[PDB]
């Protein structure tokens, strides 16, 4: 009869991500393919 199936590769029910980036410093150079939330 009934079949309930829940198939999720990533499941997150409650999350709180905190990223703090601070860069006081001079003269830094980078090549970044993909950046989320960051400082060069």
Q: For binding to its own copies (CB under 8 A), which residues are involved?
A: 1-40
**Least separation, in Å, of the C-beta of 16 and its own copies?**
5
4-30 core/surface letters (b: 16 or more CB in 10 A; e: else): eeeeeeeeeeeeeeeeeeeeeeeeeee
Give the pair of three-digit tokens for residue 27.
């003269």
**Least separation, in Å, of the C-beta of 22 and its own copies?**
5
**Least separation, in Å, of the C-beta of 13 and its own copies?**
5
């Amino acid at each position: 009869d009934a079949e309930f199936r829940h198939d999720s590769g990533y499941e997150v029910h409650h999350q709180k991500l905190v990223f703090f980036a601070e860069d006081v410093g001079s003269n830094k150079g980078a090549i970044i393919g993909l950046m989320v939330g960051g400082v060069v």
